[PDB]
């Protein structure tokens, strides 16, 4: 509707609009499930590449800028598929960029001291960690108009943020099915170069391809330029 009543006669706080508060708040970026046995769990481990272009809502927000630098905070919510918590010991290993990722439920990859791991019981309150600005360049960039050497067009490897190796501790397999929600919160934000906002459904994580057969108009349509 449009109830033209109750007019706000007081200016609002500029803090609200500040990039800091715009890109604050923890948010779900990934959901991993390690049930006992079915399709992809006769293993007992998971390798999750820290991916931000996971949920379009977050992504479209970032894409508003060309280059962005920031620290991140991760929190691990874990419980069985039905919300129940059991006394199961877990291990989350952080595999830094350009570092060997577990391939087996017991790869030596899990013992490497340089790959920092965090231990926590399922009953323990959520595990929290802060992962810095791993990029080799002065800032992350959502766009790279060049080539890093074509199928590898626009791919910038200077953005790789690392991987998270989850799994249950113990020689044997875990008797429980797990499903953990990964929350991420950007700290210390800085953005440069503001660009036009997305106006076409996203079709790929790596590029800005759009369904050219169906190009949608940014604003709804009406009958006449005067019907209002």
């Amino acid at each position: 509707n449009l109830i033209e009543t109750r007019c706000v006669l007081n200016h609002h706080s500029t803090q609200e609009t500040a990039i800091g508060n715009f890109f604050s708040r923890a948010g779900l970026v990934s959901i991993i499930t390690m049930p006992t046995t079915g399709t992809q769990n006769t293993d007992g481990y998971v390798n999750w590449d820290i991916d931000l272009m996971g949920y379009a809502q977050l992504r479209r927000k970032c894409e508003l800028f060309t280059y962005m630098r920031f620290d991140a905070e991760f929190t691990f919510v874990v419980a069985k598929p039905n919300g129940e918590l059991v006394p199961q010991l877990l291990q989350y290993m952080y595999v830094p960029p350009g570092a060997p990722k577990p391939t087996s439920r017991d790869s030596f990859a899990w013992q490497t001291a340089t790959n920092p791991s965090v231990f926590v019981k399922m009953t323990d309150p959520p595990a929290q960690v802060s992962v810095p600005f791993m990029s080799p360049a002065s800032a992350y960039q959502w766009f790279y108009d060049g080539y890093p050497t074509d199928l590898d067009y626009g791919q910038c490897p200077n953005n790789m943020m690392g991987t998270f190796s989850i799994r249950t501790v113990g020689i044997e397999k875990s008797p429980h099915s797990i499903t953990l929600r990964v929350y991420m919160r950007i700290k210390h934000v800085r953005a440069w170069i503001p660009r036009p906002l997305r106006n076409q459904p996203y079709l790929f994580k790596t590029n800005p391809n759009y369904k050219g057969n169906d190009i949608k108009c940014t604003s709804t349509s009406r009958d006449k330029i005067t019907t209002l």
Binding site: Y67, F143, D145, R195, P196, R198, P208, N213, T218
Partner: protein, 239 residues
């Protein structure tokens, strides 16, 4: 920037001159002036090469004809000049590259013509196909001198509204008034020196928001000449 009622000038740089009208209405990208790269350990044991020879002059690109149905054009930097003059062999034989730009856009039309051209610069101008997966070709991703034509100017061939491109260093050309634009562009990267061949720091767009109109019998194609001038262009050899 440049329009009717402005004292005609003659800017000369090197072995080249352009008769452009002096109009103190130039666009200065992100409020910055093109300067000489701040000390970085790489150019500490390998000082940067700054050819002021035949690299600092006025490059004029082959004019483009503007017809009632033209959809737009675009150029990638530094790709555009990579094949042109010493700016090419210099940018090629030298690994790293870094430079700012004086970008001049200019129409030539009668006072009986009408049209509106938006002229903006866009850092990291990645493009996307119509799709299934398929990264754009190499001929449209890095068009070079000739440039490439826009196919879907409404989303800028990148799934993003044209309606919002003014959030970038833009400049309007409204035949009814001015007839030429000018833009100062400072080097923009995530590192002081990048690769002059692989990466294109930004793209130049010339889109006709308001189509070109005239009454038949008048020149049917309006020229759009673009002149480029490098500012404080350095190169790292690493040898």
């Amino acid at each position: 920037a440049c329009g009717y009622s402005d004292r005609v000038a003659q800017l000369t740089i090197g072995n080249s001159t352009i008769t452009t009208q002096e109009a103190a209405n130039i666009v200065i990208a992100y409020g910055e002036w093109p300067e000489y790269c701040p000390d970085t350990d790489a150019t500490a044991v390998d000082k940067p090469t700054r050819p002021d020879v035949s690299v600092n002059r006025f490059f004029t690109l082959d004019t483009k004809s503007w017809a009632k149905d033209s959809k737009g054009w675009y150029w990638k930097f530094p790709d555009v000049l990579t094949e042109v003059g010493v700016f090419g062999q210099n940018a090629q034989f030298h690994y790293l590259y870094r430079s700012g730009f004086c970008v001049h856009v200019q129409c030539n039309a009668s006072k009986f013509h009408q049209g509106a051209l938006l002229v903006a610069v866009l850092p990291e101008y990645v493009l996307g196909t119509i799709a299934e997966n398929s990264h754009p070709p190499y001929a449209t991703t890095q068009p070079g001198q000739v440039g490439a034509v826009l196919t879907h100017p409404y989303v800028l061939d990148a799934g993003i509204p044209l309606s919002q491109l003014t959030v970038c260093p833009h400049q309007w050309i409204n035949l009814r008034t001015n007839n030429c634009a000018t833009i100062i562009v400072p080097y923009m990267n995530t590192v002081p020196f990048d690769s002059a061949l692989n990466h294109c720091n930004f793209g130049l767009l010339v889109i006709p928001v308001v189509p070109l109109d005239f009454n038949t019998g008048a020149t049917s194609e309006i020229p759009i000449t673009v002149t480029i001038a490098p500012m404080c262009a350095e190169f790292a050899g690493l040898r």
